[PDB]
Swiss-Prot record, chains A, B, C, D, E, F, G, H, I, J:
It is found in: Cytoplasm, Cytosol; Cell membrane; Cytoplasm, Cytoskeleton; Cell projection, Axon. It is linked to In Alzheimer disease, the neuronal cytoskeleton in the brain is progressively disrupted and replaced by tangles of paired helical filaments (PHF) and straight filaments, mainly composed of hyperphosphorylated forms of TAU (PHF-TAU or AD P-TAU). O-GlcNAcylation is greatly reduced in Alzheimer disease brain cerebral cortex leading to an increase in TAU/MAPT phosphorylations. Phosphorylation at serine and threonine residues in S-P or T-P motifs by proline-directed protein kinases (PDPK1, CDK1, CDK5, GSK3, MAPK) (only 2-3 sites per protein in interphase, seven-fold increase in mitosis, and in the form associated with paired helical filaments (PHF-tau)), and at serine residues in K-X-G-S motifs by MAP/microtubule affinity-regulating kinase (MARK1, MARK2, MARK3 or MARK4), causing detachment from microtubules, and their disassembly. Phosphorylation decreases with age. Polyubiquitinated. Requires functional TRAF6 and may provoke SQSTM1-dependent degradation by the proteasome. PHF-tau can be modified by three different forms of polyubiquitination. 'Lys-48'-linked polyubiquitination is the major form, 'Lys-6'-linked and 'Lys-11'-linked polyubiquitination also occur. Interacts with MARK1, MARK2, MARK3 and MARK4. Interacts with PSMC2 through SQSTM1. Interacts with SQSTM1 when polyubiquitinated. Interacts with FKBP4. Binds to CSNK1D. Interacts with SGK1. Interacts with PIN1. Interacts with LRRK2. Interacts with LRP1, leading to endocytosis; this interaction is reduced in the presence of LRPAP1/RAP. It comes from Homo sapiens (Human). The record marks K6, K12, K16, K26, K35, K38, K65, K70 as: Not glycated. The chain holds residues 623 to 695 of 758 of the full protein. The modification Omega-N-methylarginine is found at R44. The modification N6-acetyllysine is found at K6, K12, K16, K26, K38, K42, K64. The modification Phosphoserine is found at S19, S47, S51. There is a cross-link at K6, K12, K16, K26, K38, K42, K48, K64, K70 (Glycyl lysine isopeptide (Lys-Gly) (interchain with G-Cter in ubiquitin)). This is Microtubule-associated protein tau. Promotes microtubule assembly and stability, and might be involved in the establishment and maintenance of neuronal polarity. The C-terminus binds axonal microtubules while the N-terminus binds neural plasma membrane components, suggesting that tau functions as a linker protein between both. Axonal polarity is predetermined by TAU/MAPT localization (in the neuronal cell) in the domain of the cell body defined by the centrosome. The short isoforms allow plasticity of the cytoskeleton whereas the longer isoforms may preferentially play a role in its stabilization.
Length: 73, 73, 73, 73, 73, 73, 73, 73, 73, 73
């Protein structure tokens, strides 16, 4: 049994911008209201209850490269 | 049994920007209200209750490269 | 049994910016209100209750490179 | 049984900026109010209750490189 | 049984900035109010209750490199 | 009177060459004869009189980028 | 009167070459003869009279970038 | 009168070369003869008269970047 | 009158070369003859008369960066 | 009158070379003959008359950076 694993990757991911310009994020307000009584969470439970998220995300390029390499034997 | 694992990676991820410009994040206000009584969390539970998040994120490039390499035998 | 693990990585992740510009983060105010009575947390529970987060994050580049290499035998 | 683990990494992560510019973080105020009575935390519980976080984070580059290498036998 | 562990790392993480500019962090005020009665914490519990955090963090580069190398046999 | 000048240039000038080959500059000779009596040269005056030039110029890439910006008022 | 000058230049000028080959500059000879009587040279006057130039110039890349910025008022 | 001058330059000028090969500068000889009587040279006057130049110039890259900035008022 | 001058330069000028090869500068000889009677040289006057130059210049990279900044008022 | 001068320069000029090879400067000889009677040289006057120069210049990198800043008022 001879196994040779030799993949080759010379790739590129790129971006360029002259400018991103003016960004204005001015949402109005709001309310989140939640009523509950009894809460029971067990065994790898992930959660959020009741939230308001105001997010401005402006990266000067945000390229992503993901590689998974696996050999099972 | 001979196993040779020799992948090759010469890749690149890049970004460039002249300028990002002016960013104005001015959201209005708000309310988050939660009523509960009894809360029981067990065994690897992850959570948040009741939150307001105002986030401005402006990286001058935020590229990501992720690699996973595994051999199981 | 002969196993040779010799991956090669000559990659790069880069970013450049002329300037990031002016950033103005001026959100209005708010309220977070939570009512509870009895709280019971057991066995690796991670949480937060009731929070207001005003975050400005402006890195001059924040690229990330993550590598996982594992051999199981 | 012969195992050779010799990965090679010549990578780089870099960033450069002309300037980051003026950053103005001036959020309005707020209230966080929490009512509870009985709190019981056991066995590796991590938490926070009731907080207001005003954070300005402006690194002159904050690139990250993470490597995990493990061999199990 | 012969095991040779000889990974090689010649990587670099770098950053440079012309200037970071003027940073003005001037948030308004606020209140955090918490009512509780009975609190019981046991066995590796980590927490904070009731806090106001005003943080300005401006490193002249804050790159991070993390390496984990482990061999189990 | 408000005047804003902010041009952006992200251009590139490049060349690649496999080899420079074999270059032979083997001109024959010659004679240059100049006869005059009176020479009157004044105020931003230049001359080249009576010359033989054998010039070999072989740059391994010799690209040029010329630029200029001006404002008057 | 408000005047703002902030041009941005992220350009590059480059070259690559595999080898410079074989360059042979083997010109024959020559004669330059200049005859005159009276020489009157004044005020920003320059000259080259009577010369033989054998020049070999082989830069391993000789790119040029010229720049200039000016404002008057 | 408010004048702001803040140009940004992140440019690069580069070259790469595999070898410089074989350069042979083997010109034949020559004669330069200049005959005159009266020489009157005054006020910012320069000359080169009667010369033989055998020049070999082989820089291993000789790129140039010229720059200038000026404001008047 | 408020004048602000803050240009930013993060540029680079570079070169790389594998070897400088074999350079042979083997010119033949020559004669330079200059005949005159009266020499009158005054006020910022320079000359080179009657010369033979055998010059070999082989810098292992000889890049130049020239710069200048000026303001008047 | 408020004048602020704060230019920033983070540039680099560099070179790398594998070897300097074999350089042979073997010119033949020659004669330089200059004949005159009266020499009148005054006030910032310089000359080179009657010379033979055999020059070998081989710096192992000889990059130059020239700079200047001036303000008048």
């Amino acid at each position: 049994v001879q196994i040779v694993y030799k993949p080759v990757d010379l790739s590129k991911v790129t971006s360029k911008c002259g400018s991103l310009g003016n960004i204005h994020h001015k949402p109005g307000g709001g309310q989140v209201e939640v009523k509950s009584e009894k809460l029971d969470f067990k065994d790898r439970v992930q959660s959020k209850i009741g939230s308001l998220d105001n997010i401005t995300h402006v990266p000067g390029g945000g390229n992503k490269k993901i590689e998974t390499h696996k050999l099972t034997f």
